[PDB]
């Protein structure tokens, strides 16, 4: 009972986590500190390392170099366990019918990928591999966790930081969407996500606007890193899968009071010095371990703590079960006018496409002789109201850029209102 896995070093052995290794810059191969006679304490002094085979022709190694309280305050506060609200469901039982029954109102934790339909690389997939497929020269968004600021840099420059010792900075890559890279073919969203996604179901293949590039996020979180409380852009529901390590989620239900507190907190310039979990009633501590998948519903205010080096894949999506919440979080995001780095591209365009489908569903309901579900009719009313606000004569200029081609909002709005009026009877 065997399989084939990558190996390294001259010894041609698989990666052993208890042995110090150094990557030769010439052949890009990792060598054990024992195999090539380089002790771990010697590693910081080495600027360029060449293995002995490469040293013969590529030259000798250039062995000439020449906050904490926020984490402590997070671990200090006592939080209810996520077992109270976060449900555990096997992947095979996490179906579209299950979503309709439970309404997707609380987070779901799937301990085993089996049945989810999720496609991820094997645990023998390392950050060095991420650099090769995404691209060493690709500019990525790196978050200075201590300073809570974002800075763009080369991916090879960050992965150089990742594969170093005595990391004087706490840097994270949580905004790396690789759907346009070679690594896009390695990760596919869970089948439940694709069924629920508005873009997956209702976005035309001939659409001139690019689809929201929010499907295949990759996360590389260093040890003792911290991600502050936030709402995914556009109230988008999210799925997080931990390939290696683990990550702790602090989830707050998007109650009316909690959402108002978040907006007031997030808008404050000193929001990086205010622990938001101390303002809410209940904040749940969810530990998502290696190989586990966490589904986060629309609008939930969540923060992540990373105790060990963790590699995770995430994705955002929009579904018909939380149309009201998705709009409300978008309204909060629109009023905040925060940075558009974590934004949801063409969120309104997806709504316009959804509204077009609802009109066709209303027409089909007349032909099929069946009433549309009440949550769709209510969601149509919510979307129709948003359509009027977006295409109001005073505010059409802002939302016109996200209007799909060959679209008559006045015709679409009037038809939706009439069909909704009919369906209410």
């Amino acid at each position: 009972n065997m399989a084939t896995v990558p190996v390294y070093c001259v010894c041609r052995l698989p990666y052993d986590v208890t042995r110090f290794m150094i990557e030769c810059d010439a052949c890009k191969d990792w060598f054990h500190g024992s195999c090539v006679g380089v002790e771990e304490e010697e590693a910081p002094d080495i600027d360029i390392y060449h293995c002995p085979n490469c040293e013969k022709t590529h030259g000798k190694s250039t062995l000439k170099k020449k906050s904490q309280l926020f984490i402590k305050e997070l671990r200090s506060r006592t939080f209810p366990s996520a077992e109270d609200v976060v449900a555990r469901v096997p992947g095979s039982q996490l179906t579209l019918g299950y979503m309709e029954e439970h309404g997707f109102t609380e987070p779901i934790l799937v301990p085993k990928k089996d049945g989810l339909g999720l496609a991820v690389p094997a645990p023998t997939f390392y950050v060095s591999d991420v650099e090769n497929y995404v691209g060493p020269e690709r500019s990525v968004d790196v978050t200075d966790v201590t300073k809570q600021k974002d800075c763009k840099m080369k991916l090879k420059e960050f992965v150089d930081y990742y594969y170093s010792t005595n990391r004087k900075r706490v840097l994270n890559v949580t905004n790396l969407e690789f759907s346009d890279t070679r690594m896009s073919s390695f990760v596919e969203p869970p089948d439940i996500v694709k069924k629920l996604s508005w873009v997956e179901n209702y976005w035309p293949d001939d659409a001139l606007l690019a689809k929201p590039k929010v499907t295949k996020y990759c996360l590389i979180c260093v040890k003792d890193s911290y991600t502050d409380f936030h709402i995914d852009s556009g109230g988008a529901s999210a799925w997080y899968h931990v390939l290696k390590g683990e990550k702790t989620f602090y989830l707050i239900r998007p109650a009316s009071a909690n959402i108002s507190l978040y907006e007031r907190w997030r808008s404050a310039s000193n929001h990086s010095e205010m622990f938001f979990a101390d303002q809410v009633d209940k904040c749940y501590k969810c530990i998502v371990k290696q190989g586990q998948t966490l589904f986060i519903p629309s609008g939930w205010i969540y923060a992540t703590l990373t105790p060990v080096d963790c590699l995770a894949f995430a994705g955002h999506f929009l579904h018909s079960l939380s149309v009201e919440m998705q709009m409300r979080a978008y309204e909060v995001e629109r009023r905040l006018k925060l940075g558009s780095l974590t934004q949801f591209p063409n969120f309104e365009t997806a709504c316009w496409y959804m509204g077009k489908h609802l009109l066709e569903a209303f027409k089909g309901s007349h032909k099929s002789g069946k009433q549309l579900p009440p949550h769709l009719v209510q969601g149509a009313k919510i979307l129709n109201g948003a359509f009027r606000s977006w295409t109001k004569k005073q505010a059409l200029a802002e939302h016109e850029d996200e209007l799909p081609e060959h679209f008559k909002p006045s015709q679409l709005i009037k038809d939706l209102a009439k069909e909704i009026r009919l369906s209410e009877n």
Binding site: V17, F20, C24, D25, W30, A43, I46, D47
Partner: peptide, 7 residues
């Protein structure tokens, strides 16, 4: 260069 620590 790039290194991998122990555990």
């Amino acid at each position: 260069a790039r290194t991998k620590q122990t555990a």
